[PDB]
Design a protein around this motif. Structure first.
Motif, short mmCIF file in Angstrom:
data_model
loop_
_atom_site.label_atom_id
_atom_site.label_comp_id
_atom_site.label_asym_id
_atom_site.label_seq_id
_atom_site.Cartn_x
_atom_site.Cartn_y
_atom_site.Cartn_z
N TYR A 89 17.65 12.09 -5.85
CA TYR A 89 16.28 11.75 -6.21
C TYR A 89 15.27 12.21 -5.17
CZ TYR A 89 18.55 8.72 -9.59
OH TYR A 89 19.33 8.23 -10.61
N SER A 90 14.17 12.78 -5.65
CA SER A 90 13.01 13.04 -4.83
C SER A 90 12.22 11.74 -4.68
CB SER A 90 12.14 14.13 -5.45
OG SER A 90 10.90 14.24 -4.79
N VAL A 91 11.88 11.37 -3.45
CA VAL A 91 11.13 10.15 -3.20
C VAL A 91 9.87 10.48 -2.41
CG1 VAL A 91 11.19 7.81 -2.26
CG2 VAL A 91 13.29 8.87 -3.10
N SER A 92 8.71 10.10 -2.94
CA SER A 92 7.44 10.47 -2.34
C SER A 92 6.58 9.25 -2.04
CB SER A 92 6.66 11.40 -3.27
OG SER A 92 7.41 12.55 -3.62
N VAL A 93 6.00 9.20 -0.84
CA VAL A 93 4.93 8.26 -0.57
C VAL A 93 3.65 8.91 -1.08
CG1 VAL A 93 3.65 6.94 1.15
CG2 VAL A 93 6.10 7.36 1.46
N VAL A 94 3.22 8.51 -2.28
CA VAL A 94 2.11 9.17 -2.95
C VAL A 94 0.78 8.82 -2.30
CG1 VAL A 94 0.85 9.40 -5.12
CG2 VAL A 94 3.34 9.22 -5.14
N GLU A 95 0.61 7.55 -1.97
CA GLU A 95 -0.62 7.07 -1.37
C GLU A 95 -0.34 5.81 -0.56
OE1 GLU A 95 -3.57 5.63 -4.06
OE2 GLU A 95 -5.26 6.12 -2.74
N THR A 96 -0.95 5.71 0.62
CA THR A 96 -0.82 4.51 1.43
C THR A 96 -1.98 4.40 2.41
OG1 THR A 96 0.64 3.24 2.91
CG2 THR A 96 0.61 5.63 3.21
N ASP A 97 -2.38 3.17 2.71
CA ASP A 97 -3.33 2.93 3.80
C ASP A 97 -2.62 2.28 4.99
OD1 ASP A 97 -2.89 0.34 2.95
OD2 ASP A 97 -5.00 -0.13 2.56
N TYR A 98 -1.29 2.25 4.91
CA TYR A 98 -0.38 1.81 5.97
C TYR A 98 -0.39 0.31 6.26
CZ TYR A 98 -0.28 6.84 6.75
OH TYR A 98 -0.14 8.19 6.57
N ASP A 99 -1.55 -0.34 6.24
CA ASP A 99 -1.60 -1.75 6.60
C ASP A 99 -1.87 -2.71 5.44
OD1 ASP A 99 -4.27 -1.16 6.21
OD2 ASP A 99 -4.95 -1.90 8.16
N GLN A 100 -1.93 -2.18 4.21
CA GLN A 100 -2.07 -3.04 3.04
C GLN A 100 -1.07 -2.70 1.93
OE1 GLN A 100 -6.09 -3.88 1.58
NE2 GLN A 100 -6.94 -3.12 3.52
#
Length: 161
Positions: A89-100
């Motif tokens: 499987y390809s696994v992607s962090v699509v979007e994050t603000d890291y602290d929420q």
């Protein structure tokens, strides 16, 4: 799918809560729903990737699973091979603000797992804000998930240490 620009793995480390799920697999959705999610821990792995350790309650017993997310050649992109079930499987962090929050997306890249797509909402707080839920729902709809398959997982206050 897009990957978080300028992804910074060190800020992505630590404790997350698996708050939301969308999957096009009835079998997988049902398996996840029979559990209560406790916490997840993200830590660096030796290959430059991530170890994702998920703690959950199954049948009133705390359990843990660890998944090795191997680097896939660009930051925020990983590969996971399933030891039991096969496929990669390809696994992607699509979007994050890291602290929420973090929005993850996976889909099979090899084997019949290619049929399987999954979006995950991670939150730094176990009960995500309503705006986080809306963000997740909007992302899932854009990725072609039906509304019925966009769910928010049962949580447990146990298994925390």
């Amino acid at each position: 799918v897009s990957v978080q620009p300028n992804f910074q793995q060190d800020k992505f480390l630590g404790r997350w809560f698996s708050a939301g799920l969308a999957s096009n697999s009835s079998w997988l959705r049902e398996k996840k729903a029979a559990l209560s999610m406790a916490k997840s821990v993200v830590a660096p792995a030796t290959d430059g990737g991530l170890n994702l350790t998920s703690t959950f309650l199954r049948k009133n017993q705390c359990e843990t699973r660890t998944m090795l997310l191997q680097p896939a050649g660009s930051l925020g992109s990983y590969s996971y091979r399933s030891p039991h079930w096969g496929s990669t499987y390809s696994v992607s962090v699509v979007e994050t603000d890291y602290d929420q929050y973090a929005l993850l997306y996976s889909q099979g890249s090899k084997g019949p797992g290619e049929d399987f797509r999954m979006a995950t909402l991670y939150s730094r707080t176990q009960t995500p804000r309503a705006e986080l839920k809306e963000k997740f729902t909007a992302f899932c709809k854009a990725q072609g998930f039906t509304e019925d398959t966009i769910v928010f997982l049962p949580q447990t206050d146990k298994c925390m240490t």
